[PDB]
Ligand binder design. Structure first.
Ligand SMILES: NC(=O)c1ccc[n+]([C@@H]2O[C@H](COP(=O)([O-])OP(=O)(O)OC[C@H]3O[C@@H](n4cnc5c(N)ncnc54)[C@H](O)[C@@H]3O)[C@@H](O)[C@H]2O)c1
Ligand SMILES: NC(=O)c1ccc[n+]([C@@H]2O[C@H](COP(=O)([O-])OP(=O)(O)OC[C@H]3O[C@@H](n4cnc5c(N)ncnc54)[C@H](O)[C@@H]3O)[C@@H](O)[C@H]2O)c1
Ligand SMILES: C=C(C)CONC(=O)C(=O)O
Ligand SMILES: C=C(C)CONC(=O)C(=O)O
Ligand SMILES: [Mg+2]
Lengths: 358, 358
């Protein structure tokens, strides 16, 4: 009789669309295995800018505080380009959210599904080898949050700046999260930095290496961010855990999403040291397809399939949604973003096919 | 006939190996096209460390000060991991060289040669659409040179930091180079930033946008760095000029190199406002293969071609090198990096074959 409380935040763009299908798939999971979910929905992002007037209004932050997990869509859109930097949906809501709940550990699992190599935009012989990867991205530190940042001066000497700064304890905790995930997988961690140039990357590399002494079963490799970007295309199969800074993990996880077939595949979990977890798709609000019922809901759906995994240890419920996405796709069903030409289904139609595989 | 004075800084790892082939190609190009190069060789990087105790000896910097152009291989490797940050080949030699000669404009032309699509690691239908773009990368500013940078504190409170800082004049001159490049190509500039988060990217985007008013014949599009990483895989054909910060250009250009088939294919030019140039492969010293005579010399050879073109306007000589490369590849010869189930030619064989095709 487990009754948990989710604070659903849909956001902007394809946010509200794919969020409906995530609920759809859940409700079947609820009455299928035996638990309740009490979905309380709030406004965040540019939506909260004309339904409250502020990207993260007090009410919204309050609902999260009271839930056992936040289900999240995405924010951002061209409508809010021209607000001040601090008051847009990205700096105004999402980055604050992450910092407020100290959600330092970002998990983005990217895998090529059995027999789905058609989706993969790589060459057939590369895609054949398949791949199964988890990006462990430091989420609350680094250049996205560092101080100082701002703009000063005038004219051609106007100067703008951001600070890629890390404190050792921030590196230690995300590194631990990486080695623990590796222990539960294939015992390989690839740490990605630019330690031949950046001072912060030198500290990253040294701390990760120190941390490795508490995990002698894990193989630790170090690679530079520019090389990482080739290796993902050339040998995606050689990766297990990808340990990354905030900005490098941002970059690398989209590349990984693409090689699995689309941005619409990659789910994500953002967890703090307590296990409290926000669950959003890795990608953004996709303005160019927002409002049209064409948008892969898999990433949003599988997110909740991670929420019941990590926030609530309900493995059978999570293994359900996951093998239900595998079966719909195994049957040749589909949204437009994925390769192969055959009448795509809408977001709704993908939501249903999957809710049915439940 | 007066010679041009070429400082040859082959460096570490595969550097000496591929530089030897560039010199062999250049000697034949000199005969066939009537011009004279005076090669003066200098130690740099790890090799200079082993000879002098210094990664950038005063003798080497003198040599470059006295040269008409610099032909550079690559620096760095495992032998030097444990040196103090400022003695290492990369911070101690390459970055200072770029900074000393004010080589703000980095040009990396990535092209998939018509007929070599089996080399491209993208899916065959994607690779069929073609790929021909040039990264225009700001090379002397941004996080790789910003201050403050360093490390402070101790224990878990140790912090390390680097500053991504741009002045408007730095963005203006690199933006201008990208729009001029676009004017000679297909009149599209795609500018890469992270303007939804970074103050420095906001200034980047604003300044590029304002520079575009000077180029009504050119399309300007703005894309986020994480998304750019996907678009290169999904739609390589859509790119013409890719305008990037120092670190973002560093990152994306390795991905561009890989989709042309190998890091070993991508040459580069680094130019200051007076047109003085340093020419080097875009990639590193390849320590995993260094000394085995298997590295692809094409990047170094095409770097020498850019030298002739950009430093000396010997355009016919540079065209011949490019065509000789394409003919050898069309004839089925390939080094081990170029995907094929044939016996690969060595580094020195590839150089000889290119030389004979001049
Ligand atoms: N998590 C977030 O809230 C977050 C993260 C990234 C970007 N954004 C915001 O999103 C907006 C657009 O940014 P972007 O275009 O660089 O990133 P994006 O991820 O939104 O889109 C990149 C490309 O992938 C496609 N795509 C993304 N999700 C898809 C899905 N579910 N199904 C099918 N296609 C999908 C888009 O159509 C687009 O072509 C911006 O305002 C940005 O600030 C928000
Ligand atoms: N301009 C420079 O001097 C420069 C630039 C980048 C890296 N580096 C240094 O190079 C060293 C290696 O760095 P890395 O491994 O990240 O980058 P890398 O570019 O040297 O190698 C990346 C991968 O590409 C392969 N590769 C590169 N050039 C090749 C060629 N000519 N033919 C066949 N394969 C090739 C390598 O074998 C490796 O597997 C490091 O010390 C790094 O600091 C130097
Ligand atoms: C929404 C932002 C603050 C930009 O951050 N971007 C990501 O997390 C991503 O692109 O995955
Ligand atoms: C050797 C360095 C100073 C690191 O720089 N790396 C690049 O410039 C690249 O990947 O091109
Ligand atoms: Mg690079």
């Amino acid at each position: 009789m487990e009754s948990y409380n989710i604070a659903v935040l849909a956001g902007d763009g394809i946010g509200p669309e794919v969020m409906a299908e995530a609920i759809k798939v859940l409700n079947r999971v609820q009455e299928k295995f035996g638990f309740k979910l009490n979905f309380n929905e709030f406004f965040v992002g540019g939506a909260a800018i004309e339904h409250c007037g502020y990207p993260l209004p007090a009410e919204t932050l309050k609902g999260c505080d009271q839930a056992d997990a936040i289900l999240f869509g995405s924010v951002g859109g061209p409508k809010w380009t021209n607000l001040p930097p601090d008051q847009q949906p990205e700096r105004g809501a999402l980055l604050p959210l992450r910092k407020h709940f100290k959600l330092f550990c970002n998990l983005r699992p990217a895998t090529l599904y059995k027999g789905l190599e058609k989706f993969c935009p790589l060459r057939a012989d590369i895609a054949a080898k398949g791949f199964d990867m988890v990006v462990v991205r430091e989420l609350t530190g680094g250049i996205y949050f560092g101080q100082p940042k701002g703009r000063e001066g005038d004219g051609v000497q106007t100067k703008a700046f951001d600070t890629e700064v890390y404190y050792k304890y921030e590196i230690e905790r995300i590194a631990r999260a990486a080695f623990e995930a590796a222990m539960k997988r294939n015992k390989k961690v690839t740490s990605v930095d630019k330690a031949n140039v950046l001072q912060s990357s030198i500290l990253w590399r040294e701390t990760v290496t120190e941390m490795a002494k508490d995990y002698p079963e894990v193989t630790l490799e170090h690679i530079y961010i520019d090389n990482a970007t080739m290796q993902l295309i050339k040998s995606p199969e050689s990766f297990d855990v990808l340990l990354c800074s905030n900005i490098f993990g941002d970059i690398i996880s989209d590349e990984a999403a693409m090689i699995t077939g689309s941005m619409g595949m990659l789910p994500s979990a953002s967890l703090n040291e307590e296990g409290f977890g926000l669950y959003e798709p890795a990608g953004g609000s996709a303005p160019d397809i927002a409002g049209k019922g064409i948008a892969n809901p898999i990433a949003q759906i599988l997110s909740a399939a991670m929420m019941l995994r990590y926030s609530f240890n309900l493995n059978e419920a999570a293994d359900a949604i996951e093998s239900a996405v595998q079966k719909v796709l195994a049957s040749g069903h589909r949204t437009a973003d994925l390769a192969d030409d055959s009448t795509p289904v809408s977001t709704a139609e993908m939501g249903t096919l999957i809710t049915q595989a439940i």
